[model samples]
Target chain A: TAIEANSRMLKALIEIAKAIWKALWANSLLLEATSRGDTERMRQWAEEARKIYKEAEKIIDRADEIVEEAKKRHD
Target chain B: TAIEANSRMLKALIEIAKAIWKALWANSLLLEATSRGDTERMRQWAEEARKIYKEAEKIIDRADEIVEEAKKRHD
Candidate 1:
């Protein structure tokens, strides 16, 4: 009955996991650089902070996608 | 089991009230000193802010205790 919905939701969840992995990996790298006092790596992270933040933003957009896909498939 | 949960919840609420009191008191004093331009008192409050923040952190720890206790007691 919910085959289409299940597919959309599962796809969204997969995207969410990928996005979370990227964001968390980036954050972990930044944290490691900071703890090690690696000024160059820290500077690089600072320079790309906004881009890193967007990883989470993309995940949020994927969540919205899930809701929209659900609505289209179910309603 | 339910009795244990009730006790846990009550202790958590008590801790929460204490945390709120400390936070509000500290913040209000800080704000008051700022509005009046009491640099000396503001500095004092700033020094005390960490202590008040620690108080709130303790309450958060207590809340975790309640969560663990209730989780253990219930399904």
Candidate 2:
């Protein structure tokens, strides 16, 4: 059970990292697009970035659940 | 063309960052799995990570193409 718990924690960590990175890059592009004033392209890029952020935030919520689950198991 | 080229370049940069972050986390988790001797989990996680890497590489290839195209336009 400890092994499995740890494994789950590891998976959560990986997902969290991936989510954060995706969000980071997406926002960067979004900002750049804003600066360039590329209206249509900016709109498209912003939409894409928002999608990524929303998904990433969802994953983070999942991560929080995992943390709770892991703690329960550990306790 | 220049605006489109720049937009493409920005997209590529975003993808590159996302790819690097995905690879980093996946490998880190893989290492932990290996240490724990989590054969099945390791296999599954490794497969997922590999798929990400493959897709990321393709995006990178597209980025390269965009770079060349951007250069041509700039020139």
Candidate 3:
């Protein structure tokens, strides 16, 4: 399980991270919408970030679970 | 570093590609949310993605190191 310590779980973690990164960037754009004097548009952006944030959290949680499992197996 | 040529590291390159796409989608979702005017939720999404991106980069770097080492070994 040596490879297990740094295997598939690692890949999953990486993807989770990237998704979060991109999501945040998108979030920034949404924040800008607020400053642009488009109230309706700002609302739309905010909701999008909210839903995506949930998705990101779930994915990260799953990744963490996998890593924990890997650690157990590694031991 | 030929594999390294791919900026994100070829480790979970496919996964990385998918995340970028997902993030963009999330952005669109955030836009929708903003249109609906969900401020708190909007900030949540942005912050979550930001945190996640950092973790993802670290994992990617570790994978790249392995690839680079492997290539060097083969050479």
Candidate 4:
């Protein structure tokens, strides 16, 4: 059970990292689009990047819950 | 016309960045799983990470096409 639980935790944590990376990458592109004076494109890229960031924040919050549960179990 | 093309190019570039970040994050998790002595979990994470890397590679190749098209248009 611990193995399975730990595995789930690891997976969740991995997801957090993935989302963070995606947001970073998208933001970079957002900057480039802005520099190019592509207003519409900039908006699209910014929106997408914001969505990724929000997703990651949600995952991070979920991961915290999992972490708390694990801590309680160990205590 | 150029705006549309440039917009498409910007969007494609953003996708490329997103994929690359995902792969990097997944690989990091894979490493952590390996270090933690979770063989089955490691395998699962490794497989997922590899898939992400493959996807990123494909996107990178796709980005190259967009880059080429942009260059041609500017020439």
Candidate 5:
């Protein structure tokens, strides 16, 4: 049961990463900002861009959490 | 049935993409080459790096194909 639980957790991590990856490359407004060398705009974009990576990093965090939690609960 | 099939295919794509993402970031051989200014080694790494991206591109290709095939089979 713990193995299946771990499997499900891994599956969820895969789906979340895939979701982020798909949304990441879907459109390219950032392309315009960088091309024009817009500091003001780039500064604003950094907020959202950093948020994306922050959220992405949590996917890894939760993945590790899943392993630890599963072990404690089941092992 | 086709919807479920499509779901499974998409899930599989997620797994594949996630697999690539995980392996892409793990342990850094390319970093050493880039920092050393080793064009010879960098050139060698390029072959594997390019192959990595090429394979990643196919994930998108297959994702699109899944949607098309789903519509044809079910819609």
Candidate 6:
């Protein structure tokens, strides 16, 4: 249970960090693209960031399952 | 060799994600701190980001060992 749950948490954390990295990079690109008046690339990264955020949300959702399982096991 | 090397690469990738997450967050905080005239917190986050970057560098170094091992295995 510990390894299963803990590793999953770590995996989830990795996904979160991955998501953050992409979005943060995208935001910087968004600013730069704006400054350069580049519309297409800005929207592209914005959509990419949005997708990453949504994808990471699934990890958060699954992470709750681990917590719930842990709680049930505790009881 | 496959599992050992591949998973090591994943772990290195995870560390890079984690490092990027921290530094990107810290950089944002630093700008916010500057805007709010908080030099100390700005420097703190900047230092934190730098440390994270440095820490992740070791993972990169270790990852190269995997590549070297794989190359030798191929030979």
Q: Taking the candidates in order, what DockQ does each have?
A: 0.02, 0.02, 0.07, 0.02, 0.05, 0.05
How well is each residue in B1-75 modelled by candidate 5, as lDDT tens digits?
A: 433543445455554655466444321244323335466875666677667666666766776676677667745
Name the better of 1 and 4 by DockQ. Answer: 4
Worst 10 residues of 5 chain A by lDDT: A22-31
lDDT by candidate, in order shown? 0.55, 0.63, 0.58, 0.58, 0.53, 0.60
Task: Give the alpha carbon lDDT tens digit for every residue of A4-68 in model 6.
Answer: 55466557766676777677777678677767866777668757755775686676566555444
Off by over 4 Å in 4: A31-34, B1-75
Best prediction by DockQ:
3
Q: TM-score of the second chain in each model?
A: 0.67, 0.72, 0.59, 0.64, 0.55, 0.62
Residues B1-75 of candidate 2: C-alpha lDDT, one tens digit per residue: 444645665667677667776656655665676678566655564576567767876876776576566555432
Where is model 5 more than 4 Å wrong at Cα?
A1-75, B19-23, B26-28
Supply candidate 3's per-residue lDDT for B23. Answer: 57
Candidate 4 lDDT over A1-75, as tens digits, reads: 444344445445445655665675565455334344456885686577778888878888987788878767867
lDDT of 4 at A44: 85
- C-alpha RMSD of each candidate structure in angstroms: 11.7, 21.1, 11.0, 20.1, 9.2, 8.3
Model 3: per-residue Cα lDDT over B1-75, one tens digit each: 333323334545554555555556656767777789676655665666555456546555665565454334231
Steric overlap count per candidate: 0, 0, 22, 0, 0, 0
Candidate 1 vs candidate 4, TM-score winner? 4
Best by lDDT: 2
Candidate that beats the other on lDDT, 3 or 6, i.e. the better one: 6
DockQ score of the complex predicted as candidate 5 = 0.05
